[PDB]
């Protein structure tokens, strides 16, 4: 008898990407997508010009 402790995934796949730009001063991006955990998201400061 062996018990099923944490498993690992090494082959992943990505789809339906999302960016959600925001002005230099209006807070920072929300992206309702991020709401779900099935999506992985990271928040980055990007240049925004004229």
């Amino acid at each position, epitope marked *: 008898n062996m018990a099923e402790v944490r498993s690992y995934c090494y082959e992943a796949s990505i789809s*339906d*990407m*999302a*960016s*959600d*730009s*925001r*002005c230099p001063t209006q807070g920072e991006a*929300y*992206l*309702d*997508k991020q709401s779900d955990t099935q999506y992985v998201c990271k928040r980055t400061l990007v240049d*925004r010009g004229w």
Partner: antibody
Amino acid sequence: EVQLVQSGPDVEKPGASVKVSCKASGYTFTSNYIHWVRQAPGQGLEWMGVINPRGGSTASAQKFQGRITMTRDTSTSTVYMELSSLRSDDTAVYYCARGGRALFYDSYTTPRDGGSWWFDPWGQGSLVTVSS
Amino acid sequence: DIQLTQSPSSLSASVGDRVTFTCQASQDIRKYLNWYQQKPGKAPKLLIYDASNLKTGVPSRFSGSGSGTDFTFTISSLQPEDVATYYCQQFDDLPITFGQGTRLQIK
């Protein structure tokens, strides 16, 4: 030719979720903010929300916070609207429209607008009825 | 959040008349106002962007004006294709609202 098209009219259960499609034609799909606006049969128009075809950015009004979801589909150049937990007021017609200088991912209204602000492809209107 | 009254509620006039609609909002909407007319069962009609600008393809039969908070649309000469409900709506601050309507009728 720049033009939007909705799905057919639909009838759903109270408390269900309805998804209406909006397909674009005649323009680069990643250059026009898609605005969704409701209209009850006897009522006027009230803006529901906005999505950007690029990056799937989203926003709406508090009249739909927690029920409305808006997603992109870059392949066929489509946008999909889900209303969740349907309610007796939802029996209406919903409109999708292309809008302005969709540069990155937002509403972006402090800069300019107009020139069919969102009014070239108002499509045909999606009639939805919510009952049993 | 951007209460906008659109007066009158309805009107009816003969062909070849000028008609004007007013909309005043409780807020400052400097130039972010737009105008449509829609039939029942229609996509609305190209009327006005920026409350002062005619769109390509729109007949010069229509005009729009107004600066600060209240704005006037005008049909120069009434025609049978002018039966619709006319709407004015702002663009700013993003609880976007419209007017309830201004309805027409030919005599």
